[PDB]
Amino acid sequence: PGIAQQWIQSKREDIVNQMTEACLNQSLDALLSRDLIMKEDYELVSTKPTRTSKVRQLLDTTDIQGEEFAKVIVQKLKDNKQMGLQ
Amino acid sequence: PGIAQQWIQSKREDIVNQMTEACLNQSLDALLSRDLIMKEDYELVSTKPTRTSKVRQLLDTTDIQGEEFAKVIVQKLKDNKQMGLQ
Amino acid sequence: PGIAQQWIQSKREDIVNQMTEACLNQSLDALLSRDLIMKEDYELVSTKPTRTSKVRQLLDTTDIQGEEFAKVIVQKLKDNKQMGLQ
Amino acid sequence: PGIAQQWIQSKREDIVNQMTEACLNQSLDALLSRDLIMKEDYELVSTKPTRTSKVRQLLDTTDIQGEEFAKVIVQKLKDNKQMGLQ
Amino acid sequence: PGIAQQWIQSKREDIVNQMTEACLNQSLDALLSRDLIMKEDYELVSTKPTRTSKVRQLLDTTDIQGEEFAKVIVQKLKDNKQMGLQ
Amino acid sequence: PGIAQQWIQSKREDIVNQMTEACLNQSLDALLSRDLIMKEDYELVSTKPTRTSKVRQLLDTTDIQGEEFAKVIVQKLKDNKQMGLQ
Amino acid sequence: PGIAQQWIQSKREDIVNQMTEACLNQSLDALLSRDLIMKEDYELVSTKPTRTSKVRQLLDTTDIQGEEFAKVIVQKLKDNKQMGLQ
Amino acid sequence: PGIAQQWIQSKREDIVNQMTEACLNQSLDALLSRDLIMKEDYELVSTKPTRTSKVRQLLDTTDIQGEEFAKVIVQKLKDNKQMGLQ
Amino acid sequence: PGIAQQWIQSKREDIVNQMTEACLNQSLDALLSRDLIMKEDYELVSTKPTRTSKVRQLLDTTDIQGEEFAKVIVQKLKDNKQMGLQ
Amino acid sequence: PGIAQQWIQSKREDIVNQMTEACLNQSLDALLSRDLIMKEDYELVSTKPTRTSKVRQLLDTTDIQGEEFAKVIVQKLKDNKQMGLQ
């Protein structure tokens, strides 16, 4: 389940066609800052040639990683003036 | 039987060679928005290397899942200007 | 089958090595003008590094999308002084 | 969908071959004025060697960013005496 | 048996490591020109990640499809200055 | 194949290191005179920083565009006292 | 793990939007001075068209190369008056 | 077992996240120099989209190929100033 | 096997880090002069962003194309004062 | 490796910010005197708008070209009263 994952599964159809590739990559590179994502799934989500799987290979990784994963991907998506829901 | 499944079995031969892979994936990722499909059959239908089973592994999953499953896969196939039958 | 698709499958070997990448992109970006192609298969056909799949990932998308799709890709290929067959 | 995006997808084929590179850049640099676009997709849209992708890498970024993004790119395209539609 | 298939099974070990992927794809896309191959095995042979099965998934498809299939795959392999045997 | 393209593929190695950048540009700008090349591949061939791709991005564009394209690029290369072969 | 890599993964989100492209290139060309980086990954990190991957294709290369790699990339980032943390 | 394979299975977890993709490819292309690896598993290990399987599809190929295979992959990993163990 | 391919597989590790990108392109464009390479693998080897695959996507194409292919790529590498072995 | 290249990789960080653009160009034009560099990489290194890549696009070309290349670029850098190391 998860408390940080109350919303990213709820608006996954929102966050696939609204989170741009740099707002993807300003956060996904930030996931390697706390050693909080792994250091070899990064070149599996970045190596996707299209962006529609470059965002979703993160978006199922955040479905499987813990709530301590998604609690830091969310304010990196609220600091961008995109849309606001916690 | 089903009321939402009155049509997807009726035009399964239509929907295999007319529903493209992104119109597949704009709806199949939307199935995880309501927690309405599961979170581990998704990487079983997306991991199909060809598209002719990437669409049909959804299309038998919607044959087995309920009418509350297929009632939301249908207007995600009517909003796309493809073909119209309810 | 299709009536607009009477010709693009007929001369697919013609249209792969004769439709240039800008005549590709002057029409493929025009497919997003009527909301007539999707908004996330576009960065799957444009992200192809070579042009020989940058044209064909459209050319099978127009094999799977309807005749209302291919009826607008054809006069965008007849306004260019390339070759004329409807 | 979007209300500010009622028009930029509607006339994307217009705005690719009519919005010049400085009317591109007088607005795209203005997107960094409100911290309203990101500060590392800017050198991804400006680094495109041709102009036909220097305008469109903005034009799909405005397809994915919100209506608060496109509501400020539009009067920066109406103050220029080019063409008028809201 | 087959008369057009007198040679492609005879030099299958030749044609796997000598027919390059574009000479593969200049002919395999040409197989969809006469509606002569199907329109959903194409994205099963192209979706092979390696080329050593991207050529052979055609090369067993031409073992199972008729002599009217292989009679058109052969001069698309003789027009290329590669090797000549009918 | 082509009848006007009997020679430009035949002497492409000649025409890359013998057609200078202004004899490139006196003809490539002349291709926009008949609306005979497109109006957004022009700033893709001119934006090449080196001349060795500024000539060849035309020279593969004339490999893909028709014989009505190459039949007008040839006497713009025979009026210049460079070399004569039709 | 690494002792020189105690910090570059720690402030990777810092070093992506603060290390400029010449402070990138004054150090990345200096990595070829000791034969300490390879001589064919250099034109893979420099060939990135945007700077946001021109810095990060080094920044994951320093995640995978040893602590003898990152111990020389760090004082080339402390001699520049940018920010100081070892 | 093997004598050259005394170490690559011993530090496979080391060599997956420390051997970079060009130090992968400076050696894996060198394996085709002695005709010592095959000429159609090369485009099966290079076609892996991520690097974490682009290195390991070599790293199990060197688990199955002989000690004459691994005795030449090792000094191509000791000439690089990475880490030293025979 | 091949007689012209006695050497290019023998010194592939030489020819990857010694054949520069213009000595690549002065020969690879010359391969389209005799209609001797194809006209749609050219924009697959040139579209490689790095040079280390821009040379090798030719160097495996010459591993798969015939000895009549490699017999003309070799004196285009001996006329350049680089290194001499037939 | 190379014997003439014992030093230019050793002091590449020296030679990037110490070899001025005319001492670049008095030697790089001299490389076309013996037909010793090519005649179409010259307008790829000179067309670099900045000098920091106008010197380095030579400085990796001399990393890939032979020791007969670098043995003549060195005394053209020792005749200038700049710094002396062979």
Author numbering:
A (entry chain D), B (entry chain A), C (entry chain E), D (entry chain H), E (entry chain B), F (entry chain I), ...: 433 to 518
Provide excerpts from the study.
Upon cognate ligand binding, NOD2 oligomerizes and recruits RIP2 via CARD-CARD interactions. Our biophysical, structural and functional data show that RIP2, via its CARD, can form helical filaments, plausibly nucleated from one end by activated NOD2.
Indexing of the power spectra and symmetry refinement revealed a left-handed helix of 3.56 subunits/turn with an axial rise of 4.848 Å/subunit. The final cryo-EM map at 3.94 Å resolution shows that the filament has an approximate outer diameter of ~75 Å with a central solvent channel of ~25 Å diameter. The crystal structure of RIP2CARD can be unambiguously fitted into the cryo-EM density, with both N- and C-terminal ends orientated towards the outside of the filament. Manual adjustment using the clear density for the α-helices and the larger side chains such as tryptophan and arginine, followed by real space refinement, led to a final atomic model which comprises RIP2CARD residues P433 to Q518. RIP2CARD assembles into a helical arrangement using the conventional type I, II and III interfaces. The cryo-EM structure reveals that the type I and type III interfaces are polar, mediated by interactions of R488 and R444 (type Ia surface) with N457 and D461 (type Ib), and by contacts between E472 and E475 (type IIIa surface) and R483, R488 and T484 (type IIIb). The type II interaction is more hydrophobic for instance involving C455 and M470.
